Structure formats: C-alpha cells, structure tokens
Amino acid sequence: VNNVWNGMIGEVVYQRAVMAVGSLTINEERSEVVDFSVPFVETGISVMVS
Amino acid sequence: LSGQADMIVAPLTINNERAQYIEFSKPFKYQGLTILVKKEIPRSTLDS
C-alpha cells in the first residue's frame, strides 16, 4: 500500500524480525523484496462451492 | 559439476545430497514417487 509494506513482510524488511514462519505464499513481488526458502507444502488456488 | 555443463534443464528432482553444492530454482512441477503395476483382463465371464 502506497509503495510501503503493511507488517508481516514489513516486519522482516525493516530488520525488526529475522524470520516469518507461518502461512506465507510465494509470489513474484514477494520474492522480489525478500529472499525465500524451499517450499515445504504444495498449494495454489482451488474451487469449492457447496 | 566438472565445468562441462552450465544448464541442466531436464527432470532433476531436488534432493539434499544434490543441493549441498549446487544451485536450484523454484520448481516447475510437483511430483512424488509411486508404484507401477500392470492390470488384468478378466473381470466377468457371462459364459459359465
């Protein structure tokens, strides 16, 4: 937002924290601003309607 | 590794023993070892 980062990735990118273990998702822009590690569970987008 | 290749673009499933000293990119597939077997023809007779 407004070319600035709203927490989470912001916390990593402002040297406040050192990792962000959780439920992050890999993306082009996200991997562009902060390095990543090897993915450890497959995921994507899925459809689910009752 | 012995300076004889620079690109390795072919199925090269990532493993610890390889990535110890080698560079990898984000995977472009998602595989997993399974088991293979052949099927059988007869299931019903209708002639007994």
Swiss-Prot record, chain A:
The lineage of its organism: Eukaryota, Metazoa, Chordata, Craniata, Vertebrata. It comes from the Eukaryota. L-glutamate binds at residues 23, 25, 30. Heterotetramer. Forms heterotetrameric channels composed of two GluN1/zeta subunits (GRIN1), and two identical GluN2/epsilon subunits (GRIN2A, GRIN2B, GRIN2C or GRIN2D) or GluN3 subunits (GRIN3A or GRIN3B) (in vitro). Can also form heterotetrameric channels that contain at least two GluN1 subunits and at least two different GluN2 subunits (or a combination of one GluN2 and one GluN3 subunits) (in vitro). In vivo, the subunit composition may depend on the expression levels of the different subunits. Found in a complex with GRIN1, GRIN3A and PPP2CB. Found in a complex with GRIN1 and GRIN3B. This is Glutamate receptor ionotropic, NMDA 2A. Belongs to the glutamate-gated ion channel (TC 1.A.10.1) family. NR2A/GRIN2A subfamily. Changing residue 44 to V: In FESD; likely pathogenic. The gene is GRIN2A. Contains an N-terminal domain, a ligand-binding domain and a transmembrane domain. Agonist binding to the extracellular ligand-binding domains triggers channel gating. A hydrophobic region that gives rise to the prediction of a transmembrane span does not cross the membrane, but is part of a discontinuously helical region that dips into the membrane and is probably part of the pore and of the selectivity filter. Changing residue 16 to W: In FESD; decreased protein abundance; decreased localization to the cell membrane; no significant effect on calcium ion transmembrane import into cytosol. Changing residue 43 to M: In FESD; decreased protein abundance; decreased localization to the cell membrane; changed glutamate-gated calcium ion channel activity characterized by affected receptor kinetics.
From Swiss-Prot, chain B:
NMDA is probably regulated by C-terminal phosphorylation of an isoform of GRIN1 by PKC. Its phosphorylated state is influenced by the formation of the NMDAR-PPP2CB complex and the NMDAR channel activity. It is found in: Cell membrane; Postsynaptic cell membrane; Postsynaptic density membrane; Synaptic cell membrane. It comes from the Eukaryota. Glycine binds at residues 11, 13, 18. A hydrophobic region that gives rise to the prediction of a transmembrane span does not cross the membrane, but is part of a discontinuously helical region that dips into the membrane and is probably part of the pore and of the selectivity filter. The extracellular N-terminal domain (NTD) is a site of allosteric regulation to modulate overall receptor function. Component of N-methyl-D-aspartate (NMDA) receptors (NMDARs) that function as heterotetrameric, ligand-gated cation channels with high calcium permeability and voltage-dependent block by Mg(2+). NMDARs participate in synaptic plasticity for learning and memory formation by contributing to the long-term potentiation (LTP). Channel activation requires binding of the neurotransmitter L-glutamate to the GluN2 subunit, glycine or D-serine binding to the GluN1 subunit, plus membrane depolarization to eliminate channel inhibition by Mg(2+). Belongs to the glutamate-gated ion channel (TC 1.A.10.1) family. NR1/GRIN1 subfamily. It is linked to Neurodevelopmental disorder with or without hyperkinetic movements and seizures, autosomal dominant: An autosomal dominant neurodevelopmental disorder characterized by severe intellectual disability and developmental delay, absent speech, muscular hypotonia, dyskinesia, and hyperkinetic movements. Cortical blindness, cerebral atrophy, and seizures are present in some patients. Neurodevelopmental disorder with or without hyperkinetic movements and seizures, autosomal recessive: An autosomal recessive neurodevelopmental disorder characterized by severe intellectual disability and psychomotor developmental delay, involuntary and stereotypic movements, spasticity, and inability to walk without support. Intractable seizures manifest in some patients. This is Glutamate receptor ionotropic, NMDA 1. It comes from Homo sapiens (Human). The gene is GRIN1. The chain holds residues 506 to 553 of 938 of the full protein.
